[PDB]
Amino acid sequence: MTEYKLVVVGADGVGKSALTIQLIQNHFVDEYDPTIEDSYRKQVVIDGETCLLDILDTAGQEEYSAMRDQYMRTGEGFLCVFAINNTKSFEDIHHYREQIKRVKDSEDVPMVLVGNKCDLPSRTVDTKQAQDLARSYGIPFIETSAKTRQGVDDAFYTLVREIRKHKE
Ligand SMILES: Cc1cccc2cccc(N3CCc4c(nc(OC[C@@H]5CCCN5C)nc4N4CCNC[C@H]4C)C3)c12
Ligand SMILES: Nc1nc2c(ncn2[C@@H]2O[C@H](COP(=O)(O)OP(=O)(O)O)[C@@H](O)[C@H]2O)c(=O)[nH]1
Ligand SMILES: [Mg+2]
């Protein structure tokens, strides 16, 4: 089977952990320790390919040490997550994409832009705004809810698909 190393990044509170746990463990966590960073592995079939997904759920403090830089650059693809009711988290996307380009030392890194919490009633980030940002980057965009599980499998599988085509 093919191993894929995925890294879920984005501002605190956007739902990186809920998204990962929903995909790995099939349940919605409401109060996952905001500081716990860990890797999770899941065997799954994507487009008929058996895949082992190694998924780094990032957390902790905004540090830029050489060890963290090294942990991140093992990512083959990146889920860049913001929440549709958190303007600041959307604005922060550019920064995360810049940090990815830096530690990977490349301007084409497989990435998917993810607008989480789409179950929530009053969003301040419009679908169009985020699509526009995605198309500027050349990356896919998907809306997700870690609560209802909408889009969750597709967000991760779509990232896997972006890694395949980068590998040609
Ligand atoms: C994420 C990432 C990807 C690829 C390579 C990296 C290399 C080094 C460090 C990384 N990370 C570490 C965690 C982190 C990072 N950048 C911000 O930016 C917060 C705000 C907004 C813009 C500037 N800054 C002021 N915040 C963070 N953390 C806030 C507190 N909890 C967890 C975490 C989300 C950057 C790399
Ligand atoms: N309503 C709703 N709440 C969510 C969703 N995803 C995460 N949350 C909640 O938002 C908070 C932060 O989620 P968490 O996964 O810890 O964010 P992280 O800092 O990105 O890991 C928690 O209270 C979650 O229960 C979602 O899709 N919808
Ligand atoms: Mg978390």
Author numbering: 1 to 168
What sentences appear in the manuscript?
The oncogenic impacts of the KRAS gene were first reported in 1980s, making KRAS one of the first identified oncogenes. It is known that KRAS protein functions as a molecular switch: it responds to upstream EGFR activation and regulates the downstream MAPK and PI3K/mTOR pathways, eventually controlling cell proliferation, differentiation, and survival. Clinical data have implicated the driver mutations of the KRAS residue Gly12 (G12), and basic studies have shown that such mutations impair both this enzyme’s intrinsic and GTPase-activating protein (GAP)-stimulated GTP hydrolysis activity, promoting oncogenesis. Despite these progresses with inhibitors of KRAS(G12C), the most prevalent and oncogenic G12 mutant variant is KRAS(G12D), which is estimated to impact more than 50% patients with pancreatic ductal adenocarcinoma. We successfully developed a series of small molecule inhibitors of KRAS(G12D), which function by inducing an allosteric S-IIP and forming a salt bridge bonding with Asp12 residue, as confirmed by crystallographic studies.
Further chemical exploration focusing on piperazine substitution yielded TH-Z816 (wherein the piperazine was (R)-methyl-substituted), which had relatively strong inhibition activity (IC50 = 14 μM). Indeed, the detected binding affinity (KD) of TH-Z816 with KRAS(G12D) (GDP-bound) was 25.8 μM. We solved a 2.13 Å co-crystal structure of KRAS(G12D) in complex with TH-Z816. Our structure showed that TH-Z816 induced an allosteric pocket positioned under the KRAS(G12D) switch-II region; no such pocket was evident in the inhibitor-free structure. This induced-fit pocket was located near the α2-helix, switch-II, α3-helix, the P-loop, and the central β-sheet of KRAS. Note that the pocket shape was quite similar (RMSD 0.293 Å, 148 to 148 atoms) to the MRTX-induced SII-P of KRAS(G12C). Well-defined electron density clearly supported the conformation of TH-Z816 and KRAS(G12D). Specifically, the naphthyl moiety of TH-Z816 embedded deeply into the pocket and formed hydrophobic interactions with residues Val9, Met72, Phe78, Gln99, Ile100, and Val103. There are also four pairs of polar interactions between TH-Z816 and residues His95, Glu62, Gly60, and Asp12. Note that an ionic bond and a hydrogen bond together comprise the anticipated salt-bridge: on one hand, the positively charged piperazine moiety of TH-Z816 and negatively charged side chain of Asp12 are close enough to support an ionic bond; on the other hand, the measured bond angle (166.7°) and length (2.7 Å) supports the presence of a hydrogen bond between these two moieties.
